Every structure is written in structure tokens, then in C-alpha cells.
């Protein structure tokens, strides 16, 4: 896999945000994770965590996996990095998303994420409390 540039347009929630990629606005949905919806327990904390991590970054990048790049709602499907740090991983490490939605042929980072989830669980962080 490889990273490509993007810029932030607007935060949305824990696992979606609007980015400009190849100069077009697109809503991205983070691969391999599920944050709670805003109206659910830990939803607001997830949305805050993602918003802060991406808004504070000097460099946002998008990394597609090997399979489909957009979902049935038109959302980009990627791993997002903020100053080289993956958001998807960081959310799971902090117990603010579950590993989820692991579809064959878009699961390159599955084991990396599962490892974070294990540590978040060991620590009883957030969702796992
Ligand atoms: C993360 C991801 C979600 N989706 C679809 C599955 C779910 O469909 P349904 O809407 O039919 O439940 C939906 C969940 O995303 P959200 O967690 O954003 O709702 O997005 C994919 O198709 N591919 C993916 O990689
Ligand atoms: Ca969600």
C-alpha cells in the first residue's frame, strides 16, 4: 500500500470526515473500525479524538487498501494518517473504536489493529471499561 495526499475540509464524527482528495471533496470512512455514533456512549469522545488528531496534523494522508475504494454510500474507504500516525489504529488503541467491518481483500492492517484492540482491552480503556 502507499500513502497519498489529502487535506481536511470538515470533521464529521469518530470514523468519518470530509477530505479533499485529488482536489475533490469526498467523505471518507475509516477502514476496519467502528466508532460509536455521536448519540451513543463514547460517541462524543470518539468524534473529539478524531477531530483533534486530524485538525492538529500538518500532513493528512490517505492510504487505500487493495480492494474497493468507495462504499455503497459513495464514501472513500481508507486508512488515514495524521503526521504519519494512523487514525484508525489510534482510535482502537484508545478504546474509542472496535475492530469491525473486516471484509476480505480490504484487510491489510487487520492484525495491526487487532493488536491495538487487545492492548486497549487489557487497559479497560473507554468502550472496554
Ligand atoms: C467500514 C465499511 C463500511 N461499509 C458499510 C457497511 C455498513 O452498511 P449498512 O449501512 O448497510 O449497515 C456501513 C456501516 O458504516 P457506518 O458504521 O458508517 O454506519 O458501511 C462497507 O461497505 N465497507 C466498509 O469497509
Ligand atoms: Ca460508526
CATH number (domain holding residue 46): 2.40.50.90
The atom of ligand 1 lying closest to the CA of 106 is 25
Burial call 53-72: b when 16+ CB within 10 Å, e when fewer: bbeebeebbbbbbeeeeeee
| Structural domain count of the chain | 1
Note whether 68 and 117 are within 8 A (CB).
Answer: no
5 vs 26: CA distance, rounded Å = 13
The torsion defined by the Cα of 104, 107, 108 and 110, in degrees rounded to 10, comes to -130
φ and ψ at residue 92, rounded to 5 degrees = -70, -40
Note whether 103 and 89 are within 8 A (CB).
Answer: no
Mutate to test the pocket of ligand 1, among 64, 77, 101, 102 (most ligand atoms within 8 A of CB): 101
DSSP one-letter code for 35: P
Counting other chains too, the contacts that 37-43 makes at CB distance below 8 Å and 24 or more residues apart are 37/13, 38/13, 42/96, 42/126, 42/127, 43/13, 43/14
**Grid coordinates given for 19:** 477530505
The atom of ligand 1 lying closest to the CA of 33 is 1
Compute, in angstroms, the gap from residue 30 CA to the centroid of ligand 1.
Answer: 10
| Residue listed under C-alpha cell 482510535 | 91
Give the CA distances from residue 1 to residues 7, 39, 64, 66, 79, in Å, rounded to whole numbers and listed in that order.
19, 34, 7, 7, 10
Indicate the burial class of 44 (C-beta count within 10 angstroms; 0-12, 13-18, 19 or more): middle
Angle at 39 between CA 30 and CA 129, to 5 degrees: 75
Instruction: Please give the sequence-ordered ranges of beta strands (E in DSSP) within the chain, or none if there are none.
Output: 4-11, 16-21, 24-30, 33-34, 60-63, 76-82, 85-86, 98-99
Amino acid at each position: 500500500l502507499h500513502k497519498e495526499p489529502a487535506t481536511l475540509i470538515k470533521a464529521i464524527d469518530g470514523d468519518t470526515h470530509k477530505l479533499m482528495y485529488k482536489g475533490q471533496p469526498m467523505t471518507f470512512r475509516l477502514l476496519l473500525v467502528d466508532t460509536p455514533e455521536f448519540n451513543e456512549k463514547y460517541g462524543p469522545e470518539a468524534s473529539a479524538f478524531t477531530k483533534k488528531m486530524v485538525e492538529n496534523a500538518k500532513k493528512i494522508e490517505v492510504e487505500f487498501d487493495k480492494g474497493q475504494r468507495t462504499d455503497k454510500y459513495g464514501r472513500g474507504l481508507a486508512y488515514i494518517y495524521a503526521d504519519g500516525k494512523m487514525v484508525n489504529e489510534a482510535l482502537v488503541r484508545q478504546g474509542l473504536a472496535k475492530v469491525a467491518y473486516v471484509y476480505k481483500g480490504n484487510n491489510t492492517h487487520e492484525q495491526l489493529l487487532r493488536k491495538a484492540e487487545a492492548q486497549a482491552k487489557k487497559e479497560k480503556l473507554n468502550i472496554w471499561s
